[model samples]
Target chain A: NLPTAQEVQGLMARYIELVDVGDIEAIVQMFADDATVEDPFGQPPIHGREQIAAFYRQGLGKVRACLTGPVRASHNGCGAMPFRVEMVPCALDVILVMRFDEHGRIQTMQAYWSEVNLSV
Target chain B: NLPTAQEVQGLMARYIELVDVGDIEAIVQMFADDATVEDPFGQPPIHGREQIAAFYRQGLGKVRACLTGPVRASHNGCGAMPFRVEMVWNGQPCALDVILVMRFDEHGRIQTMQAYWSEVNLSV
Candidate 1:
């Protein structure tokens, strides 16, 4: 059926720590060849692994979360998407929806982490 | 934190049973007011409770199955879209590939659910 949400939250934290730690190699290796990553979900698709590398080189490469929320995913297919599926209390409302290929690689890294509720 | 994966699976199981039982009304109540459902990714959107009701009545109206493959869902800051449906080539009893995406509200009720599926993928 599905995976546990708390478990995924831990995974997201781990990944951000990876990106937050800035491990480009480890980060890039997590995706598939045709995988795309558009953090804001409205930006142009990042294209492929090479392009993903370019983006993460100068972007917030690590953070993540999901629900139906697809992803490159686990060998067992328990993890949900994008990695922004947070809880307890928050805004900045983010999301990372993912879909995988047969080989269990990240094919489409569709994400949405935007906000505009400011009075400024 | 969001709900546990096992929890979502259980929710999915209950939903599947609802479908299997043809509890259309109960199924409709599962959604948020302005929900949308597109059983197949490319189909026209079935927006609103009324439209959504028609969509399911036509598609899943008489459809019944044990319902296989892993269940998927989420809709909140935690969200969900595009559930994967198995296939229906050759002699298969039904269709293949389904996307039942649900976005939950604070009370955790599904705000929107897009069920993506089409006839081309249906049975012979």
Candidate 2:
């Protein structure tokens, strides 16, 4: 069966929830066993689930906590979900560029985070 | 013809260039005619070409300048290009979630742009 855009979006929402709640195991499960995560400017690219998990363990520690605002999901013949995140006193808005395999597991997850301040 | 991942990445690079240069007109050319831009945090969703252009004019004015570092692009069940941007003193790294419904245009342009930036840690 073909995966719909909504399914991907749902997965993203769940991923964000897991990260925010500090559900490490569930977060690891969101990706494929051979999933790869790249931080771009920061740490080296973490390949595979174990390494990716390790990277998160170290990184999430620095972040007090996080919350993703309403997500803007789109498919440019491909799927992309860009959203804002408030990391409490400091906010880091990120865009998750992801790719899923045939099994709906994310094969690659690349996150780009930047500091932002919005006037309410 | 299937659009290669490289094509999408190249398009994104151009998008960033136009945005950094504050080229509102060129930026609008990148999106489809029925394009839509939604800033969940501020302003109403801008739809169609004309409104999108106007949106950039007013919006880009306050940004000052911007820059994008190593971009990471992916193709999930669909395609997504996630990248980081350093907007000078006030960097707002935004991830553009876009969908190209039709053919690609010649000169790179964006139909819509929904940016996310954090002013929390702008001192770098």
CA lDDT for candidate 2: 0.52
Error of 2 at A93 (Å): 1.3
For candidate 2, write residues A1-120 as lDDT tens digits: 133456666676677777767777788887788878865323356887778888777756424333333333433211444544444355544556566777778787766532211212
Candidate 1 all-Cα RMSD: 11.7
- Tens digits of per-residue lDDT, candidate 2, B31-91, equal 7776677642234667888887887777675243333222333331112333333443335
Q: Where is model 1 chain A poorest over a 10-residue stretch in terms of lDDT?
A: A69-78
lDDT digits (tens) for residues B1-124 of candidate 1: 1444345555556677777677878878876678676554434667778887787687665345454334433222233323333333444655443435455555545565544333422334
Q: What lDDT does candidate 1 reach at residue A1? A: 11
Cα lDDT of model 1 overall? 0.50
Per-candidate count of clashing residue pairs (backbone under 3 Å): 30, 17
Q: After superposition, how far is residue A66 of candidate 1 from its true place, in Å?
A: 21
Each prediction's TM-score versus the true structure: 0.47, 0.46
DockQ of each two-chain model: 0.06, 0.06
**How does residue B70 of candidate 2 score in lDDT?**
29
Residue A43 lDDT in model 1? 61
